Design a protein around this ligand. Structure first.
Ligand code: PLM
Ligand code: PLM
Ligand code: BA
Ligand code: BA
Length: 129
């Protein structure tokens, strides 16, 4: 249950640059850049379910650690990949040349996505139960 909970974005870096590079429609970039998105994670052993809500955009994903999964990304593109744990508190995957690291430290989840020189970093904080 390490990751389980509800978290909301506190701050992020390089949203616009990153989203434009990956092919997000620009009117979604514009509507989305200042939204404080909410992430709901449910972990049960190796099985994870996560929902990410950013203003009427709702992305629901599931995966088993160390198994092939199909992740729906920012644009709607579904990608086959493997998510690994690197310790109890860290989720790592790569897709479309993007390295995604999700790290929980107490109540703060730091998500770092790097595509080439672009490092997109999001900091979220637990919000209740
Ligand atoms: C309908 C207007 C809202 C605009 C849609 C917002 C789309 C922006 C997507 C940002 C989500 C960040 C990617 C998830 C990172 C992660 O949790 O792994
Ligand atoms: C929509 C982008 C796909 C995300 C791929 C990463 C899969 C493992 C991480 C799942 C937990 C995500 C936690 C959300 C953190 C955040 O909203 O910034
Ligand atoms: Ba823990
Ligand atoms: Ba991969």
């Amino acid at each position: 249950s390490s990751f389980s909970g509800k978290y909301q974005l506190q701050s992020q870096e390089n949203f616009e640059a990153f989203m434009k590079a990956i092919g997000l429609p620009e009117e979604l970039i514009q509507k989305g850049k200042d939204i404080k998105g909410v992430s709901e994670i449910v972990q049960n052993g190796k099985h994870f379910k996560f929902t990410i809500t950013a203003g009427s955009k709702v992305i629901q994903n599931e995966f088993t650690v160390g198994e092939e999964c199909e992740l729906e990304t920012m644009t709607g593109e579904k990608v086959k990949t493997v998510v690994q744990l690197e310790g109890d508190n860290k989720l790592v995957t790569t897709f479309k040349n993007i390295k995604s690291v999700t790290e929980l430290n107490g109540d703060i989840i730091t998500n770092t996505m790097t595509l080439g020189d672009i490092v997109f970093k999001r900091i979220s904080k637990r919000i209740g139960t």
